[PDB]
C-alpha cells in the first residue's frame, strides 16, 4: 500500500542568452507517451530517454502546467492529507511557485466555502539560506534573525520550527498582502535560497448529531533554489537512499530535508515539477535533472487522511 511520487517534467522555451551562445535545440518532449529524450551529442540518434508521470513541451504556458498538478492536489488537501510539492528549474513574464498561491487559495476557498463548511485557514512562508531558517512574514523582527528547530516528541520523525509565524486567512485577498510583503523580506541580494509556503486547513463537518468529523489539511509548496547547497545536495542523496533502499537515510544532514522529511517515504502525498533547458548549452544540468526526477518516482510514500471522528 502506497503512492510513489508524482513527477512531471516541463520543457521550456528558449531563453534569450541560450539564442546569443547558438545553441540548438535538444530535448523532445511526447506528451502523450509521457516521455522526454534527450539528445547526447552531435545527424547523430545518441539519445537517452526517461518516462513521467506526465511530461510538457514549452507550447505549455507554466501555468496550465501549475494548474495540471496543483487543482487535483487540492482536493487531496481538503480530503485531508498532507501535500508538497517540490518545484525545481524555475527562472511574456516567468513565474516560480509563490506566483500561484493566490490562484491555490482562491480554489481552496471557493471549494470550502460553496460548499457551506466551516474551515480555518492558516499561512506560513519560510526561507532556507545558507542552512539557516529565515520567517519571511514576521514582520517586526529583525530581518536578519533566524529561527531555531529542534525535534518534537509528539511527532518523534518530525520537527517544530518555534517563532514561525502562522497567519490566519478569511478572504483570497490578505493572501496577496500578505505575499507581497513577503518579497519585500528576502530582498537582500535569494538565489541561493529555498522558499517552503504552507497553507494549513482545519475542517469540521457535523454527521449525525453528537458526532463529528475534524480534518486538518496541509500543503507545502517548495520552490527549490538551483544549481555546495547542503539542502540541495541532502535532497539529491535522500532520494538516492530511499530508491537504493539504503538503511540511513540522511535526513537530518540539511534543514531542508529535515524540515520536509514526511515528503519523502513518509506519510505525505509528494508531487515534483522540474523543468528544464531545451538548450544544448544546458546539457549537463538537464541530464542531471531527469536524474534525480527519474530516481524520485521510484520512491513510494504512504499518505494517511488526518481525521477525527
Ligand atoms: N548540487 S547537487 O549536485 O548536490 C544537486 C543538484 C540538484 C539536485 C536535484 C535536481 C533535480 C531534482 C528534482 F528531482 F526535484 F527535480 C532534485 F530533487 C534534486 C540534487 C543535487
Known amino acids: ?25 535538444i530535448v523532445e518532449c511526447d506528451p502523450v507517451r509521457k516521455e522526454v529524450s534527450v539528445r547526447t551529442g552531435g545527424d547523430k540518434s545518441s539519445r537517452k530517454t526517461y518516462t513521467f508521470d506526465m511530461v510538457f513541451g514549452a507550447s505549455t504556458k507554466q501555468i496550465d502546467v501549475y494548474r495540471s498538478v496543483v487543482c487535483p492536489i487540492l482536493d487531496e488537501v481538503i480530503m485531508g492529507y ?16 509563490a506566483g500561484i498561491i493566490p490562484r491555490t487559495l482562491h480554489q481552496i476557498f471557493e471549494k470550502l466555502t460553496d460548499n457551506g463548511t466551516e474551515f480555518s485557514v492558516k499561512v506560513s512562508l519560510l526561507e532556507i539560506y545558507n542552512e539557516e531558517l529565515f520567517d519571511l512574514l514576521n514582520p517586526s523582527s529583525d530581518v536578519s534573525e533566524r529561527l531555531q528547530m529542534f525535534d518534537d516528541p509528539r ?18 485577498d490578505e493572501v496577496y498582502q500578505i505575499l507581497e510583503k513577503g ?14 509556503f504552507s497553507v494549513t486547513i482545519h475542517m469540521k463537518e457535523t454527521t449525525i448529531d453528537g ?24 535532497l539529491g542523496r535522500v532520494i538516492t537512499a530511499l530508491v537504493e533502499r539504503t538503511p540511513h537515510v540522511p ?10 522529511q514526511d515528503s519523502l517515504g513518509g506519510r505525505t502525498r509528494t508531487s515534483i515539477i522540474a ?26 510514500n504512504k499518505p494517511e487522511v488526518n481525521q477525527k471522528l
Open 183 to 196: 518579497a519585500a523580506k528576502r530582498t537582500t541580494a535569494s538565489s541561493r535560497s529555498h522558499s517552503v
Open 211 to 234: 458526532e463529528e468529523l475534524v480534518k486538518i489539511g496541509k500543503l507545502n509548496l517548495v520552490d527549490l533554489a538551483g544549481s555546495i547547497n547542503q539542502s540541495l545536495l541532502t
Open 1 to 25: 500500500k502506497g503512492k510513489n511520487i508524482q513527477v512531471v517534467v516541463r520543457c521550456r522555451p528558449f531563453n534569450l542568452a541560450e539564442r546569443k551562445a547558438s545553441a540548438h535545440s
Open 251 to 260: 535526513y537530518r544532514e540539511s534543514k531542508l530535508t529535515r524540515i520536509l
Open 82 to 97: 498532507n501535500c508538497t510539492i517540490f518545484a525545481y528549474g524555475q527562472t511574456w513574464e516567468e513565474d516560480p511557485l
Open 155 to 172: 511527532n518523534k520523525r518530525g520537527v517544530i520550527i518555534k517563532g514561525l509565524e502562522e497567519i490566519t486567512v478569511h478572504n483570497k
Open 275 to 300: 523543468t528544464i533547458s531545451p538548450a544544448s548549452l544546458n546539457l549537463e544540468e538537464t541530464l542531471s535533472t531527469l536524474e534525480y526526477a527519474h530516481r524520485a518516482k521510484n520512491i513510494l
